[PDB]
Write a protein that binds this ligand. Structure first.
Ligand code: A1IR5
Length: 162
């Protein structure tokens, strides 16, 4: 069902996250981590303290799809295990590392979100946006609800972190 998912998304904030390569999304899916440039790191840390859930929605550039979505479980932190991101740019330019819990590891093609517009990006289609673009609550909730259910994930433990 979708009830626990709707509960996790209640009053959430949503951010579009863009990667030039699939390998970085695969690393994030395997390790439960994400890292971004300082400008976005500051926005996400502010958001994490402001809302019950902060949701990252991932898209690999030129793939025509979103690759899933995850909830921040921590602010960014430095000094952990190195992550061998594939960068376009040195690794020192990245901020710290956020821990994330995946909510959905399934893909969604952009063709399926063509009816969703993001007020925070001039009401352009939600697929359109820079890395770090915030997605308004209603649009972000509907986008997440369009993804295929991911039956491998149990949201019970996620709910307990809220
Ligand atoms: O594609 C990217 N660009 C930047 S600036 N940082 C990262 S961290 C993982 C992927 C990725």
């Amino acid at each position: 069902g979708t009830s626990k998912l709707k509960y996790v998304l209640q009053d959430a904030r949503f951010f579009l996250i863009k990667s030039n390569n699939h390998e970085n999304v695969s690393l994030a899916k395997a390790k439960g981590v994400w890292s971004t440039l300082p400008v976005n790191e500051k926005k996400l840390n502010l958001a994490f303290r402001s809302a019950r859930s902060v949701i990252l929605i991932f898209s690999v550039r030129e793939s025509g799809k979103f690759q899933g979505f995850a909830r921040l479980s921590s602010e960014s932190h430095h000094g952990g295990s190195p992550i061998h991101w594939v960068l376009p740019m040195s690794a020192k330019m990245l901020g710290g590392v956020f821990k994330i819990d995946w909510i959905c590891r399934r893909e969604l093609p952009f063709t399926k979100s063509a009816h969703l517009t993001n007020p925070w990006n001039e009401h352009k289609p939600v697929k359109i946006g820079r890395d770090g673009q915030e997605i308004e609550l209603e649009c972000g909730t509907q986008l997440c609800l369009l993804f295929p259910p991911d039956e491998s994930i149990d949201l019970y433990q996620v709910i307990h972190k809220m």
